[PDB]
Amino acid sequence: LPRLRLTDSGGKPLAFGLVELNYTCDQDICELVVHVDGAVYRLLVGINAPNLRESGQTPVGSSVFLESDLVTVGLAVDQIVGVDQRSENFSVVGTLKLSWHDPKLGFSPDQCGCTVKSFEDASIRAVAGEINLPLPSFSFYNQQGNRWSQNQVIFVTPDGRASYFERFTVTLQAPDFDFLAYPFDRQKFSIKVDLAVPTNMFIFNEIERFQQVVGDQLGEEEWVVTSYSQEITEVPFERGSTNSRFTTTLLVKRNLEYYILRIFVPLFLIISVSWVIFFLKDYGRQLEVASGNLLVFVAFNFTISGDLPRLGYLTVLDRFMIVSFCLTAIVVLISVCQKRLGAVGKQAVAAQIDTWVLVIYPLVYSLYIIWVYLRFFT
Amino acid sequence: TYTTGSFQLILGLNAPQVISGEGEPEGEVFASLASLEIKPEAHVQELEIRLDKDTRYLTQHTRNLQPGDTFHALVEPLPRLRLTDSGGKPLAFGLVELNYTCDQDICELVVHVDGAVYRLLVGINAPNLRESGQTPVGSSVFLESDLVTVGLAVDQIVGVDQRSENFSVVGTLKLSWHDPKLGFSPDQCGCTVKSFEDASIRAVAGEINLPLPSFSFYNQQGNRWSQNQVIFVTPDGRASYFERFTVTLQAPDFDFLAYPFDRQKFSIKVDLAVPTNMFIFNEIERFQQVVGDQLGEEEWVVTSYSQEITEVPFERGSTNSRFTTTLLVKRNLEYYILRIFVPLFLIISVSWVIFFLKDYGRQLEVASGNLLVFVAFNFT
Amino acid sequence: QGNRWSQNQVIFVTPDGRASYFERFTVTLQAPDFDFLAYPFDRQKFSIKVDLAVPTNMFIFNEIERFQQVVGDQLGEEEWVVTSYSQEITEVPFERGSTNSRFTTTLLVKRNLEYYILRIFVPLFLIISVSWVIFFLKDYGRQLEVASGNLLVFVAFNFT
């Protein structure tokens, strides 16, 4: 059995549980708070109902405890306008909508001769401070710097139904990025909207899809969206209590054909040039061609240096480039050794080395690819 | 709990209008203060003070004295002792002992000791300071500084500029203190928490006309971006501040001589903008992990961290508190080793191996080609 | 996108009630409709949309005035060449129901083709011709050496 007590809105005690409790109102207006402190329990409460021991009827009348105001939310993404891979942030353009019901905002038409009252170019905080009523203000959790806003409007109906509309361009931090498997990496773009009020005042309750969540645009894009989701949760809030959160997540991947055709095929041809020369039996020509192919490899590497992000740590592509360069240089070393062996009159050993290299090199490349796949993608 | 504050009391005798709370004084008095019939309660406090080479002058402020009160002070290790009001007009001089009596409605006093370590004894309504006997009784005679709790957390290092020697960081800051002047009565607002939003501590202090512990970043470059800025106060007077910041800080201490094997320190300094006799940092709160973990790799790897409170000289004399967070960082060594040193070693080996050849034309041609390969790799 | 820079902003009204607005602007506009697949032979549209912030039952665009040339001529060459333009008034759905008017200006533009042709394609053709012509030789060592050199020349031109 837990302890039960009753206090006013300031914390002054009024009654204590004996578990049951009773009180009678003396002041002009009494605002009460019920404390239960200690497992699952049943709490029964009534006003002007001394028969709570044996009620009989299903709960009648209006609710005794105050209820939170319910908010409908929706978000749509129009265009991803940038991604920063060193500072780990991205920028997005979209639209946001909020809707709720509050009888305190209602008005009488015969005093204005109008059905719709509107506020323009003002944040919800400013309007709340102007009309001296609490409203469900919000913020972006990972916002970097100021936010650009267009078509900002709030309008209210006589019954008290209010709605908010905004078109935004914002930059959001994303420390969850992981570029280890570049360019085969997959990322998540998460947009979080948090209410700036306690959960006992306002709470997100429904999700509205006023448009397509991810909009289609003409032409190609750098990032391709595979799927999306939307969810409502609760998170701890400053000064205790809890605040609601609305999250939109986009799963994205890069364009693979671009990287494959631009990098890997020319690299394969360059490697093949250094492999094929071992069929020659004139070792001077082999040495000269190997020396030229190393320079060609370096030139291609710095030509593609533009598609090589500088992050301060190694990706898959960097490792492959390093291994390929090392093997290309080892080819030149072996060619010099074979030239010397042929000069001293041991051509048979040079031919045996040629056969060994021709057999071994592709096996080494295939084994390295298998190892990379095992250690980075499973 | 109990409560503290000032009050107004209206007493009436056969005057039924008093219960309305608006009774104006009338007639001839009938009641008086009871405490005036006996001796007043004494307060005694003892302090140990030291006059360093550069700190030969010391001053202390006393609480307010009511008319009719008396003040006593003595010093035993001889330095000079004197008493002045808050402006500074002299009131008494030491003979070392000193004595004074209060004439004005409110008296604010300052004790001067100037010249080694000395004992200072002070009392209000306590002429027996020569032989006190009892351990220091009552409330403190000298005013006390307000104690502030501070904490800081780092979320992400977002950039480092190696030519201008500055870096940028994202994190969270928290402050908490207690001030009875900020207290309020709930029955006037029907609420337990009063809040201020989207305003700096300076702006709120200027709006409510009360001193508050404002702060700044010592090495801040340009403007600072702030989110979720809020101040809220409880009826007892407990206040707290919260902020999420993104800031760029100068760091002239960087040294890149041993690059890429260099090690650096990222130091974040928070200084109070008020004298130490008003507010002072006293405790460190760890509300989160000081260094937060993030998915993926980072350019800089944090090895260790520390947090410390110190005191630094302040403009217009006195001193101000400082809270410092330091991160020790290093670069990723595998990246540089695998990307630079191994290919360089292979290139050097190519130029070394050619000397086994006995056909010097081939050796010359291969050396000439390898020099060009070296230059190409260097610019790559 | 972001803030707009404005100069010479003025509103003046006559006693009869005739009012007019004037502004000189510099602005950055988003254009997700771009498609660069056929680069450098691509053609694009630059669209400028002005929307009234009031319901159509209050104010509506009714006439188009050509106070100047829509596309102004400037000395020197430009990266983009305007081929044609158009102006039109339409109606679009508005927040809190109803409708709002829209005024659209569209410019059809293309790149300078001579620049790309002369700078890229002719040297590439000559480089390809060098690798084609060597097969007339019957000394295969010379052919191999020239092919190896021409591959490096190709890579150098590509990164140039």
Ligand SMILES: CCCCCCCCCCCCCC
């Ligand atoms: C290393 C680049 C790829 C070249 C093709 C290799 C296929 C395997 C053929 C092995 C032949 C060995 C003959 C002695």
Ligand SMILES: CCCCCCCCCCCCCC
């Ligand atoms: C200079 C690059 C490293 C090459 C390996 C050198 C190891 C020392 C061997 C000395 C051999 C001398 C033979 C005459």
Ligand SMILES: CCCCCCCCCCCCCC
């Ligand atoms: C490939 C670059 C262009 C070179 C000109 C080719 C024109 C066609 C001539 C075919 C001649 C075949 C002779 C055996």
Ligand SMILES: CCCCCCCCCCCC
């Ligand atoms: C999903 C990832 C597929 C990666 C395929 C790489 C293909 C390399 C082509 C080399 C051809 C010579």
Ligand SMILES: CCCCCCCCCCCC
């Ligand atoms: C969706 C998972 C894709 C996994 C691709 C693995 C490729 C391994 C070879 C890498 C060579 C650089």
Ligand SMILES: CCCCCCCCCCCC
């Ligand atoms: C802590 C610093 C270690 C530096 C080691 C350098 C290794 C160079 C490798 C060369 C291999 C041929």
Ligand SMILES: CCCCCCCCCCCC
């Ligand atoms: C409208 C597009 C015309 C493209 C013409 C390309 C011309 C290539 C010239 C090559 C000469 C050797």
Ligand SMILES: CCCCCCCCCC
């Ligand atoms: C694009 C990566 C190419 C690497 C070399 C592959 C050799 C395969 C040997 C069977």
Ligand SMILES: CCCCCCCC
């Ligand atoms: C979507 C991947 C296409 C790559 C084709 C490669 C053919 C050698």
Ligand SMILES: CCCCCCCC
């Ligand atoms: C993981 C990188 C290794 C670089 C040297 C490879 C030589 C076969």
Ligand SMILES: CCCCCCCC
């Ligand atoms: C963390 C340093 C790894 C470097 C390995 C080098 C092997 C030749």
Ligand SMILES: CCCCCCCC
């Ligand atoms: C406007 C296109 C001119 C290109 C001329 C090319 C002549 C070989």
Ligand SMILES: [Ca+2]
């Ligand atoms: Ca990350």
Ligand SMILES: [Ca+2]
């Ligand atoms: Ca420095």
Ligand SMILES: [Ca+2]
């Ligand atoms: Ca597009």
